[model samples]
Target: GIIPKKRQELMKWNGWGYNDSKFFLNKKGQLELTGKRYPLSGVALPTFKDWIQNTFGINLDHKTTSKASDTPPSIVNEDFLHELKKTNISYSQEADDRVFRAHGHCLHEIFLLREGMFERIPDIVLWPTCHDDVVKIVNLACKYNLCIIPIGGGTSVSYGLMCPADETRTIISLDTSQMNRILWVDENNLTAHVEAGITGQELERQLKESGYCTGHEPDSLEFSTVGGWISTRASGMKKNIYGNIEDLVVHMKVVTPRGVIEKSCQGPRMSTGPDIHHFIMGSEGTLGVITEATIKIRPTPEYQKYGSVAFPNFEQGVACLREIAKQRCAPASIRLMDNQQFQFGHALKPGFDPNQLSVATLLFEGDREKVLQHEKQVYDIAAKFGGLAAGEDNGQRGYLLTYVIAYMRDLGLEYYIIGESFETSAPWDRVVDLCRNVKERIRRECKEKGVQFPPLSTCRVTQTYDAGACIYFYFAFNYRGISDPLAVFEQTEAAAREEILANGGSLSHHHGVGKLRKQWLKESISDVGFGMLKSVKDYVDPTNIFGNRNLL
Candidate 1:
């Protein structure tokens, strides 16, 4: 059985993963887990206190506090409840269960949950073990006029799991965790049919045991499920080599209110009138619930290597990546960070010399000889732009930071510093300007909000394509005195995003348009495109039974 016997509680309802695991704070009461231990200048508890005081004009004495609210009423009618139970699906309406499923991992959701403030909560949560179970659930929802929100690992930071605040009707969280299974592995065809509920780590582990791998390694791999990845059209860190979720997903089966939607043929490619998978890939659960998928797979690479190079400025690093992409140099992963992130890396590690130059990390996998040749070629490209090789240790640590960085979000909340990330993509010609302009817009917005320069804003190019690259921006500020932190954060992010579109970026590169970014959805997709999306929704979910706080 793919499902484990003893269910372990690994997720923290109030914060990130296991309570036992966290980014260690050193003796000086600062982040000290990453680089060499030289004390970080201009970084300490007092520094944060001072920044908070300066930015929000508020003292930490008896700092603002929020606690999770008591559970709300469940609206599941007795008839529907009876029918649901008759289906033999495992379910619960306990206060703890309902509260736990109320929201996702977004900063706004976490903030409200910590305060125990829930405007709306699911009436019940159900776990379906098979495709037929999902079919029954959807049919029940339609018959009873109940709203459904499909939950995959509960790791969404995009408010994808939030119950509708205006919903007076019954709603249930359709948990896919119980349906986890590797249905089949067709090694000859290099494909695997898998249940959508399996977490990324578990799937990879299983595949590794059989000398196969999906190569889809999202940052949330530990807790995010395959369905969630498909629903959000997520991208992994090694996307440059393995490709994004959309590229890996060859076929999928989604259970809709009307019926199940899937391809009639299982061929690699088809010239069908229209690809139905597009509607399900980034649908974010509004259109239907994805139950299973057949994805392209790969044999474990023969060898893997990591390398890094340093550049005096961000443009040089960007130019280097553009060249690598243009040359079709297929490194497994490549990322370039700006100076601000470079300094922040040192602050987190405490041991690194803060004066180190900005860096670009590269990863190579496959035949060892092939990897070595690729590494040398990439280094030569870097040298053309004045980049010095920084060695494997630097490259490995750079990738390690991606996992540890998530803990920083929880730390920011604990320390009264609010942080969030926004991403966009643009053609190679506009990559440098897009990064610079977005950073500047964030800075200007911070000043407008009276936070000023101390508010941390940094950018990094996460994935590079033949024609373009994706730019991710991280922003952290003090929201102490703000009457509404969510509103302020949204306003600031909106300003930065507006500049992104004007400068040369799309609305989103990897992250889908959830409720938070839906304000700019129509503009990003255009009126005609949006209407077409709505038309599909109308056709598939006419009664809106599967509606959640996501795209139309």
Candidate 2:
């Protein structure tokens, strides 16, 4: 009754990005992008092949993957289906529909799709058209003892969408994209009420048409949705200027099986007994499905500038960012990438000198004079740390380069190189050690795992706070000769997480602790804290009908 076409129709069923846009080996057996929609489309990547050869030390002679030959039988619930049909809720039992919604964009999930089928998938997908429809679905699901996992843009990398392997009850995927609608905008209050399923691009386009912007520009912005952002406590690259999703949200309405939890007041701050708003912000779909939100928005900035700086090493780069955090004059985005990542950026196109070392990309948004002043002020700080201005074009190119960086992961998969980018939050005092040792741990783990080639490990300072910074890492190894490559990659990543904790890093910075990171969550939050959180979940959804099996 609602959505005309599903996400599988719009985007790639087994990979990232639009269905038409992807990197594929051509008839000549050379790497090239084959879509009209993306910036990298219809382009040849000659240097990329060379880089892969040098980095992974793998031959391009072989490409392998399994297909959808064997889908596990769905344990359908006849009574629930008949009752669901009686209501306004719409659903589909198409194998592709169920299978696609089963897993997220996590490397293991992606690998499974290409190599085999998931052990279990949600039996059916229900498309709820509005808050009332979701309410009806949730109540009905509770009555039928069904487990519902909300599906937004489905770009999750944290295994947030993975179904519980032991779930015998009928698993239902609550497809929320159909409910997307801009309910209203209060220009006077500078807030907008919108449905939770609207994608970031659609939300921004709608807001921009009204001469406003949210400025919550995450790397996954194009495919990630509003509810997903809220559920993950998402941070954006431009959070320095516009703030993260938690700061942007004024009020929210979530549909738990118990009932809809709606905050009455939409104020910037309130002295309520407890933060009901924050309790569910990072719930990761275990608590309920977010229905609507009143989000803070800003008028379009008058002017903006992009710039880059070159630092001698990652330590100096971190020092520059630390000083900028204290100065409180940082731009919308000030990101520092280590030498390897900076080199990899050039590897996508051509080359940069090894002496150039660490690189920082910047973007300032504000009035013309203020933006210019901030730009100058930042360069001065960078210079204090031996940072050299690397020209605005390079800076602009780096930001523009972000959208395609994820594509490389998909491309790497084609050639049996398993890699994924992950992040952690840490205080300034422990940041450098955390970054340096994590990279070393990855290298050590790769050799211990008996990987074919030396792994590529790179680090970056993505976000800065007064006393802390968010450090992100990129790691990849040649899984060519490894048995059960996904398992090896998981072991390596798990080791890195252990090393991260041993240092001063939290489990995750932006990425929430989905099924993948839940192992470390108990220690991250003390046993007492996790138990309290679980009790809160019990009080809300006593029957635990919303069972994505994430945090608990």
lDDT of 1 at 5: 19
Prediction RMSDs, each to the true structure? 4.1, 2.1
**Candidate 2 C-alpha lDDT tens digits along 22-133:** 7777776567877766666777766777778888897777876646336666676788777877995778887788987888788888888888778889888888878988
Candidate 1: clashing residue pairs, number = 10
Q: Find the candidate with the highest lDDT and give its number.
A: 2
**CA shift of 291, model 2, Å:** 0.3
Worst 10 residues of 2 by lDDT: 1-10
* Residue lDDT tens for model 1, 1-552: 233212235456677665455444457654433343212223343244343455434454553455633567776788988897788898888777777777777778888767657888888888898899999999999998989998877777677888878988888888888888899999999999999999898998999999999899988888788899999999998876687998898889999977889888788888988788887889998988899999888999999889888887888788888998889995998899988777665444423233435788878899999998898898899999988898897788788768766766776686577888888999999988888888888888877776633577789998889889989899888776667777778788889989999998988887777777888888888899999999999999989998795975
TM-score of 2: 0.96
Stretches of model 1 off by over 4 angstroms after superposition: 1-8, 23-69, 350-356
